[PDB]
């Protein structure tokens, strides 16, 4: 259930939570998922995105 993240692609705010669209490392783009911010352990990828 924990996986290496490759890139943070997008961000949204839904139902009171920030969610990020993640491209998982080694997985095709058809496996991308939105994940709430509490699930993320990739602060430097969020930072790259926020540029």
């Amino acid at each position: 259930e924990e996986y290496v993240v490759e890139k943070v692609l997008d961000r949204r705010v839904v139902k009171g939570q920030v969610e990020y669209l993640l491209k998982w490392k080694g997985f095709s783009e058809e496996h991308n998922t939105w994940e709430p911010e509490k699930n993320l352990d990739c602060p430097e990828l969020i930072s790259e995105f926020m540029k």
Partner: peptide
């Protein structure tokens, strides 16, 4: 001790 960029998938 090297870091990795990770996340839990719902």
């Amino acid at each position: 001790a090297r870091t990795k960029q990770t996340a839990r998938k719902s």
